[PDB]
Write a protein that binds this ligand. Structure first.
Ligand SMILES: CCCCCCCCCCCCCCCCCC(=O)OC[C@H](COP(=O)([O-])OCC(O)COP(=O)([O-])OC[C@@H](COC(=O)CCCCCCCCCCCCCCCCC)OC(=O)CCCCCCCCCCCCCCCCC)OC(=O)CCCCCCCCCCCCCCCCC
Ligand SMILES: CCCCCCCCCCCCCCCCCC(=O)OC[C@H](COP(=O)([O-])OCC(O)COP(=O)([O-])OC[C@@H](COC(=O)CCCCCCCCCCCCCCCCC)OC(=O)CCCCCCCCCCCCCCCCC)OC(=O)CCCCCCCCCCCCCCCCC
Ligand SMILES: CCCCCCCCCCCCCCCCCC(=O)OC[C@H](COP(=O)([O-])OCC[N+](C)(C)C)OC(=O)CCCCCCCCCCCCCCCCC
Ligand SMILES: CCCCCCCCCCCCCCCCCC(=O)OC[C@H](COP(=O)([O-])OCC[N+](C)(C)C)OC(=O)CCCCCCCCCCCCCCCCC
Ligand SMILES: CCCCCCCC/C=C\CCCCCCCC(=O)OC[C@H](COP(=O)(O)OCCN)OC(=O)CCCCCCC/C=C\CCCCCCCC
Ligand SMILES: COC1=C(OC)C(=O)C(CC=C(C)C)=C(C)C1=O
Ligand code: SF4
Ligand code: F3S
Ligand code: FES
Ligand SMILES: [K+]
Lengths: 259, 158, 82, 86, 48, 69, 164
């Protein structure tokens, strides 16, 4: 009979958020935390709200804060004990309801890095796949598996303080993924844009992003590599390069973009 | 055992030679007042009370006695030290007020981070300015030594 | 609290509203002005500071080494401490 | 809200364990340099009987014993002072 | 009619890693040095 | 014990390089030197309002009101 | 401008184009970028205007000057709106209280629904006034309004393109 304290907020009453304690028999519940939450909703309090889809850790929708550390509920294990298992929303996020965070800023920041392949020449008619060696494909190994759970984001003390100026670990790793993709031909443009004091150099190497990553990725290592590459490759003309690309995006629609 | 603090030899000479009282100037008064107290766990340095005594005595400005000359040199070194203390308070006040006005529209965290450091910096800058304008930077090593000689000394028998 | 609801926002570079960004630029100038002024402290120390043991030093040079060329026999033990 | 494994409580104990030792040494070195100077300028010298010591002092310095106010500052500290000092 | 909530500071509850405590000790290194200098200055002025 | 000349250039220059090198390194090389910029950027920047009361404005304002400007 | 310096048309073209791309390339959203850079931009812009006055009708220099003026106008206008948004969000943060607890909390904006209607109107006015600077307007004011949306539920035209 484990005790599970869960954060609760009603968006309509707008009463101060509180932790409600539930008792669940682990014998009739699945090993993972998400199973306990589903059981609570099914049996005791159906009002409980939380995001969940894949159940196998791949969608990245069940990101929560369990006993202090961020994680995905579907991959997290229930750890029985006298101490209540405290489940709260993602740290320093606006709570839409109960355990459902507001990750709209995270989605916007990602759209800013323009995560789509860019090439100077359009695929000539009669052309097959763009060549990439096995070794080049190996470079993109630990970076293309990010499920956007947003745990590393909501674990960085620097994203807690400057959420609207710092891109955050996940977005920065994704930017390195596209700066490291041999097929992309806009390496300099991407590095010039990311070379900003607020966007990139707000990372102080806390390493909370790597510790909490549910997919076992290392966003901290990627940001360090991206900072070294930028420092070595900087040229006086980078600012003009950013401006020219901004002119190219003049007719784009209203949303975050390279500028 | 028992310890005995007695006037030092320099104090003895200064008392023998004092011709009259000496008017304390306004800046000397303020400097002594603004001087931090000193806790004498052991007695090795001059405090504000010893400095006042030195500055309240008067000596003959023409006297050619070598002993009197030492006393006058010491009194001048003590005077430069005392009037130099008048610059700390201006520095600390401006070192908090000017930063606070500048960060008056910023959050509490910013004032906690900045004001303590600017206060010490302003106080240090004020101390540098005061010691500089009191002619301490041009004193010789003989002048500074005579102005730092203790006024009370533990008695050494025999 | 409450906040003004009829603000005339800047329309161009020659029709500007006074905002906290312009105030921050004045702060930049005033802080930088302080730095120019505080440079007078370290510069004054280096210019006015003299490191001399007594008033004898200058008298020795006036009477024994006026041209700064007179050579003194060197007894190492004097300043070697042994 | 409050937890022992919190970033705040674990960063406050870590800082204490890391800095307090360094600091104690650093301040101690300054205190030691202070004592080295003090003991070379006015070493505390212990006398047996204060009254005899005071007499030898007045005799050695040519001071009239009547014009000197001797006061006991502490249980182990006496102090001779000029009574006619401005 | 609906409003979202702003969670409190995460510092009070987020789990602490050894790399995060040590990164703070690095960013606080110069702050300690100034503190020690101030203590020594104060002692040189109000002690013995 | 009584040399005709004493070589001081080597020793003095060594001290100059060591003292100058340490000071110039501390002032120029380390990224720690930008620690005051990081702290301000993290906690102080973009955190200001003109629509909230603060003591310095209140003090200046009252003292003016008291003296009738 | 009071100066005795003389510059060729090629030098004038180079200076103007350098300033134009420098301004258009700098990140406007970061306040310290504009606060630090605008003093240098204003000194340069005065010199550029003086040396490009003969070439206002020139086929190459003229367009550069016109774009440069428009960019500076958009830079000042966008900075003003985002400055007010930053004021609103900092009023909201102070209202949360110390540590988020509410302990020493400031009073909370009461006309926030109306202050968000003012900003959104300004955002749309900028879009119309500066049609060739939408990327910069979205970087600064657009993203600013997206941050406000996370606090107050209000409607603006581009709300759906900001994931709201
Ligand atoms: C960089 C500085 C390097 C060191 C410089 C130096 O020391 O030069 C000495 C050098 C030697 O001088 P000297 O001839 O020996 O004369 C001594 C001083 O000049 C005489 O010193 P002074 O009196 O001129 O100055 C003393 C000094 C020092 O101040 C004091 O002396 C303070 C004394 C305080 C005493 C408090 C006592 C409290 C007791 C509490 C008891 C509680 C009991 C409770 C009981 C409870 C019971 C239940 O004062 C100040 O600096 C101003 C006040 C402090 C302002 C800043 C405060 C905040 C500092 C924050 C630092 C960062 C912290 C971390 C932040 C994150 O001075 C000079 O050459 C000239 C002066 C300028 C020097 C620069
Ligand atoms: C304890 C005594 C000192 C107490 C504090 C004294 C404070 C008064 C200082 C007065 C002198 C001027 C200070 C700078 C004025 C502003 C200059 C400026 O705007 O430049 C762009 C400025 C950065 O200037 P930067 O020269 O490009 O880059 C600086 C780097 O150092 C890269 O420059 P670098 O490559 O030339 O590297 C040289 C580096 C060499 O670095 C060092 O010397 C190493 C130590 C660095 C850290 C020292 C402080 C540690 C304590 C915490 C610091 C953070 C809290 C705030 C501290 C006070 C800040 C004023 O020197 C500096 O850091 C620059 C010189 C001035 C530093 C002043 C503050 C620290 C003085 C520390 C002295 C004692 C250190 C002992 C350390 C322990 C071991 C002995 O960026 C910003 O303004 C960022 C603002 C973000 C928030 C928004 C603020 C409003 C925006 C509108 C304009 C506001 C203007 C005023 C800002 C400050 C308000 C409080
Ligand atoms: C930064 C400089 C800070 C200097 C502060 C001290 C200045 C000073 O003492 O001045 C007098 C002294 C002259 O010394 P002095 O001996 O005449 O008097 C100094 C007085 N005492 C000894 C009591 C301190 O000059 C300097 O030290 C400054 C020399 C500056 C030379 C710079 C050359 C620049 C060349 C640029 C070439 C570009 C290509
Ligand atoms: C061409 C080749 C160039 C090679 C350049 C190499 C540069 C690097 C090596 C160091 C050179 C500088 C040494 C210090 C200056 C000279 C010595 C000095 O002034 O002391 C004598 C002075 C001499 O004073 P004195 O009054 O005692 O001398 C009289 C001596 N008797 C009594 C014997 C007659 O020492 C003191 O006063 C005592 C305190 C000394 C404190 C030394 C502190 C450390 C200094 C070095 C700091 C290095 C920082 C960077 C490295 C990391 C440190 C952790
Ligand atoms: C690198 C500085 C760049 C400028 C920084 C901003 C400017 C404002 C802040 C002050 C900067 C430094 C000013 C230096 C000049 C003032 C130094 C000063 O007053 O020293 C006090 C005094 C000078 O002694 P005097 O013998 O009276 O005078 C010398 C000639 N006989 O020096 C000392 O006591 C040295 C104390 C060193 C303590 C240990 C190191 C502390 C750091
Ligand atoms: C909830 O209130 C607080 C912040 O706002 C998110 C802070 O920025 C910070 C971080 C910055 C400083 C200087 C305390 C803390 C700790 C804080 O209490
Ligand atoms: S880096 Fe890790 S924690 Fe961050 S979004 Fe990707 S998978 Fe999730
Ligand atoms: S915790 Fe944050 S500061 Fe960098 S190393 Fe990770 S993104
Ligand atoms: S439900 Fe998909 S990640 Fe857990
Ligand atoms: K690439």
């Amino acid at each position: 009979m484990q005790t599970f304290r869960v954060y609760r907020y009603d968006p309509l009453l707008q009463d101060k958020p509180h932790m409600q304690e539930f008792n669940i028999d682990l014998a009739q519940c699945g090993p993972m935390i998400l199973d306990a939450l589903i059981k609570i909703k099914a049996t005791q309090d159906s009002t409980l709200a939380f995001r969940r889809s894949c159940r196998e850790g791949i969608c990245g929708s069940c990101a929560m804060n369990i006993n202090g550390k961020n994680g995905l509920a579907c991959l997290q294990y229930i750890e029985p004990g006298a101490a209540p298992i405290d489940i709260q929303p993602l740290p320093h996020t606006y709570v839409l309801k109960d355990l459902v965070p507001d990750l709209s800023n995270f989605y916007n920041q990602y759209k800013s890095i323009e995560p789509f392949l860019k090439r100077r020449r359009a695929k000539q008619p009669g052309e097959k796949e763009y060549y990439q060696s096995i070794e080049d494909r190996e470079k993109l190994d630990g970076m293309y598996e990010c499920n956007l759970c947003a745990c590393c984001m909501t674990s960085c003390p620097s994203y807690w303080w400057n959420p609207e100026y710092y891109l955050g670990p996940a977005v920065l790793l994704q930017a390195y993924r596209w700066i490291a993709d041999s097929r992309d031909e806009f390496t300099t443009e991407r590095m010039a844009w990311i070379n900003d004091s607020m966007r990139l150099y707000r990372c102080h190497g806390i390493m909370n992003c790597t510790s909490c990553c549910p997919k076992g990725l290392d966003p901290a290592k990627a940001i360090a590599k991206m900072k070294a590459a930028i420092a070595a490759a900087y040229e006086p003309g980078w600012t003009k390069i950013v401006a020219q690309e901004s002119i190219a995006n003049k007719k784009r629609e209203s949303g975050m973009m390279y500028a | 055992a028992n310890l005995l603090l007695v006037p030092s030899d320099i104090t003895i000479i200064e008392e023998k030679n004092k011709i009259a009282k000496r008017r304390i100037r306004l800046l000397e008064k303020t400097g002594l007042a603004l001087m931090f107290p000193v806790f004498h766990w052991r007695y090795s340095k001059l405090d504000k009370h010893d400095m006042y005594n030195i500055l309240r005595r008067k000596f003959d400005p023409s006297a050619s006695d070598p002993a009197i000359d030492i006393c006058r040199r010491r009194q001048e070194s003590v005077r430069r030290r005392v009037i130099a203390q008048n610059g700390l308070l201006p520095g600390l006040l401006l070192g908090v007020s000017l930063p606070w006005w500048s960060l008056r529209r910023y959050n509490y965290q910013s004032k906690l981070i900045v004001l303590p450091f600017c206060a010490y910096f302003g106080a240090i800058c004020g101390r540098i300015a005061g010691h500089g304008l009191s002619w301490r930077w041009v004193e010789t090593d003989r002048q500074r030594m005579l102005g730092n000689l203790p006024a009370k000394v533990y008695y050494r028998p025999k | 609290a409450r906040v003004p609801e009829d603000i005339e926002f800047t329309k161009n570079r020659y029709t500007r509203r006074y905002n906290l960004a312009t105030e921050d630029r004045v702060k930049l100038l005033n802080w930088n002005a302080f730095c120019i002024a505080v440079t007078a402290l370290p510069i004054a120390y280096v210019y006015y500071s003299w490191y001399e043991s007594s008033e004898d030093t200058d008298m020795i040079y006036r009477t024994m080494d006026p041209m700064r060329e007179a050579k003194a026999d060197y007894y190492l033990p004097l300043l070697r401490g042994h | 809200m409050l937890r022992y494994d919190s970033l705040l409580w674990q960063c406050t104990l870590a800082a204490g364990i890391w800095f307090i030792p360094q600091d104690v040494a650093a301040i101690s070195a300054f205190l030691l340099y202070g004592r080295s100077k003090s003991r070379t300028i006015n070493q505390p010298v212990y006398v047996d009987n204060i009254d005899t010591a005071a007499n030898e002092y007045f005799k050695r310095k040519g001071l009239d014993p009547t014009k000197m106010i001797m006061m006991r500052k502490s249980s182990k500290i006496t102090e001779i002072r000029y009574g006619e000092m401005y | 009619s609906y409003k979202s909530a702003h969670q409190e500071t995460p510092l009070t509850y987020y789990r602490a890693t050894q790399h995060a405590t040590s990164s703070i000790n690095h960013r606080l290194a110069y702050i300690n040095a100034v503190f020690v200098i101030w203590v020594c200055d104060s002692l040189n002025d109000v002690d013995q | 014990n009584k040399p005709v000349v004493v070589n001081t250039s080597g020793v003095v220059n060594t001290a100059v390089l060591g003292i100058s090198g340490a000071w110039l390194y501390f002032y120029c090389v380390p990224l720690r030197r930008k620690e005051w910029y990081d702290i301000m950027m993290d906690y102080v920047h973009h955190k200001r309002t003109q629509y909230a009361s603060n003591f310095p404005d209140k003090a200046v304002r009252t003292a003016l009101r008291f003296a009738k400007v | 401008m009071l100066t005795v310096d003389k510059f060729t048309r090629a030098e004038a073209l180079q200076r103007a184009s350098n300033l134009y791309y420098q301004v258009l390339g700098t990140n406007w959203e970061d306040g310290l970028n504009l606060v630090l850079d605008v003093p240098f931009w204003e000194s340069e812009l005065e010199k550029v205007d003086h040396m490009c006055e003969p070439y206002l009708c020139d086929d190459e220099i003229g367009p550069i000057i016109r774009n440069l003026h428009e960019t500076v106008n958009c830079m000042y206008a966008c900075e003003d709106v985002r400055d007010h948004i930053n004021e609103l969000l900092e009023l909201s943060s102070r209202a949360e209280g110390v540590m988020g607890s509410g302990a020493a909390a400031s009073e909370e904006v009461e006309n926030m629904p109306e202050q968000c209607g003012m900003v959104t109107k300004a955002y749309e006015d900028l879009l119309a006034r500066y049609p060739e600077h939408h990327p910069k307007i979205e970087q600064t004011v657009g993203h600013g309004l997206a941050v406000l949306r996370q606090l107050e539920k209000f409607n603006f035209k581009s709300s759906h393109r900001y994931f709201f």
